[model samples]
Target chain A: DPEFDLLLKAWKSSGLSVGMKDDELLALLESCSYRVERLKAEELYAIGGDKLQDLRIVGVGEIRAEMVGPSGKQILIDTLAVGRILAPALLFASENILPVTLFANEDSVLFRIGKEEFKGMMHKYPTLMENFIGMISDISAFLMKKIHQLSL
Target chain B: DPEFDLLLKAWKSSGLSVGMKDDELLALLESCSYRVERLKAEELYAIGGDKLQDLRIVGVGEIRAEMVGPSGKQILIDTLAVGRILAPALLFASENILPVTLFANEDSVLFRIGKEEFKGMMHKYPTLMENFIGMISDISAFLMKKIHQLSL
Candidate 1:
């Protein structure tokens, strides 16, 4: 539980836990299986090339998502810090192809969960499901704002 | 019912009803209050400037969301067709400050709902909640992809 203590602290402030109680959050985390993955700085993780498990949260260090255009120009899409969900929107996509390539910008630790398991948890926990909606909706708005700015 | 019939047909294919049954969708729609507002071509709707309702679904014609920059240039952020929710991401946002301006590109009919009432429906309908998560996630990805392209 100590190892999970730090994660629990971070989850407490995370969008995923917005409306959830501590025990409710603990129960949801306990229901799922997660694999811990470590990445050295600048190491490649995924872009549909690597086997992408469902949800990945940055438990430690930082990760960045970059998009390489047709001309081979790389655009920095996002640099995720600890406690941030990577590509939160792409996680539940019907087709889970990541448009951006994921890599750790610094030495990093990640907690990975399977997509189906996450969905099952949402089905069982109404608060978790609602929390996720608000979180993803915010992400969508953020992205939309970015698109709007870039266009102008 | 007949007036709602066209809106129902459009709603059947929209993201809001993805995992819902016809009757379930009908019941949810019936429970809420909505106002049918019309916008002529080039009419403005909202940006925290206009009194925004909880939800606005395009029942007929088209609406576009545009962002005007400091340079006095306008960027087309979105062109929403019938049945599409306008700025789905901003609906549940805590601040509800729309970064873009909403206006009709052609004559349009919109179904406006009170935000509190819409939240109540989600609390009652689990399927509606889940379908919305997926829909918004997809929108986030689409915007991310667009941001990627523009960044290049």
Candidate 2:
């Protein structure tokens, strides 16, 4: 729980300076309309159906990453649910897009971050900004690796 | 041209151990059916709705990646054109349960990575197994970041 506590501290330290009050963040969490109770193995989560603006993060549990395309195509994006700060970088780098939706394959806990507050944090914390960019690079490298493997 | 050449070489190398004959690989190229003469900004390519099995690869120009869900939700996945490869990692990660489909947002040439050949290559390339795991990590991190950002 120290990891979550530290993340909370980092977020509070970075996010509150941008005119987002703590109550606003709490209210956002309270307003979540749905929750994934049982994440089935190989179950699909439909993304982009809800705009990034609509969903509010209340809590998270055992979230996994995946990419699914036309004709039952799918790829696994991550496995170990480690709490590494660099994990975000890897995600951004591979997806080449910010993840707006999530599904839990197992019962897992997630602490939600607000979009506006995050934007504020990015504007306030240079390190966080760097982390964001690092994520993009990760995706680029990942794609490059895929190309390399596929071409071979 | 160097990038394209490198990509082609990588593809070739990937196939070397798969027992895939040259003609088989060449035949696989047929799955890459989309083409681009020129690309511009703000363009959209529609895949899905009978386009899930279609294979798309970048041959020339640049294009962005976009996917829509069954409920008409859109997400920008990547900006790829020219020598860049767009194999729909998103779709692959989801294991073909993607609601909508994929397409290029700019004028570009695309080659489909056929389903059968794609599966065969996946079985052949050990690196692909690693790549899949890596992608899963990346996606998980992305989801965490998104939740973190939202909570902020």
Candidate 3:
């Protein structure tokens, strides 16, 4: 329940205003819970309980962009490989969140930027804030376009 | 040319083993160049030519996030809001590469985060790397799903 509470706090602090009523918000929360539960179930089945919290990055590697084919399978666009400061745009365009974790395809040092700490930095730096907002806008646009295309 | 060379060098140093051929890497570089050009153009349009080079955020509250709609229209999310930490995960999600220029959206104190400095932080933190990669995976999955639905 504390994990759920933390999740709620994070969601509230996210400043996302969907204009949903209390009931709608509750429904959304429930939906998210169910989705997360499903993901957890899948994880449990895939690697077993012992591996649940044991996830670790042994090395850094590249992530290439890929697309799904008509057959409902992914087509590789060639791997991007590891140790690159993947542009936030490219990552976003690839539709990924930051701090991407990859299993070390080889022995390497993995690097990351903490989301919470970075957010704190944005509080201090206004330019970073603006840049962040702009990037979000770009992503929102990308999502909207995808949704529209699907609807059509 | 030097900047591009530096970019390639920095990218190479970042640790992604070259997964794609030289042609593929060149294509990716070209795409990055185009994206940078577009962002620069937008920044110039948003502010102006004279202040472009000298733009600075003397105070917070100048920068805010805007909600972009389906038609590519934007709605103001907040204004001159200060003392807020932006989550690194959120920034990774947005994927904007250009430095954000903070204007005085309201009279407030401003903090600054330089791109170079942030890069250093990223280099020093492996958690940031993991989070970035995770986000990328999520985004990639979402994009694939959207594409599939569109075809349906």
Prediction-by-prediction clash tally: 1, 68, 42
Mind sharing the TM-score for model 3?
A: 0.26
Off by over 4 Å in 1: A40-43, A47-53, A94-107, B1-7, B40-44, B47-53, B69-72, B94-107, B123-126
Q: Local error of candidate 2 at B61, Å?
A: 1.3
Tens digit per residue, CA lDDT, model 1, B1-152: 47577577667857888878789988877766777878888888655413442677888888887654444455546788988887676676654234457788889877887776777776678677657766667666666556667874
Candidate 1 chain A has its poorest 10 consecutive residues by lDDT at: A45-54
- Predicted candidate 2 versus true structure: per-residue lDDT over A1-152, tens digit per residue: 55444334433443222345666444433332232233454555554422332212223334665543322334435542423221233322344334333455665443444444544444444334333433333453344333223321
- Local accuracy of candidate 1 as per-residue lDDT tens digits, A53-139: 367777888887775554555654678888887666777665424446777778987787777787777767777766776677766
iRMS per model, in Å, is 3.1, 15.9, 8.1
Candidate 3 lDDT score relative to the true structure: 0.35
Candidate 3 lDDT over A1-152, as tens digits, reads 75455344433433331343555434444434211211111111122212222211112332333344445454323333332322333332333222222222333332233344444444444343444434444453455345444452
Number of the top DockQ candidate: 1
lDDT of 3 by residue, B5-115 (tens): 534443333322134345544443444421121121112123311222221222222345443334544432334333232222233334322232323344443223433
For all predicted structures, in order, the TM-scores are 0.79, 0.36, 0.26
**Ranking 2 against 3 by TM-score, winner:** 2
By TM-score, the best candidate is 1
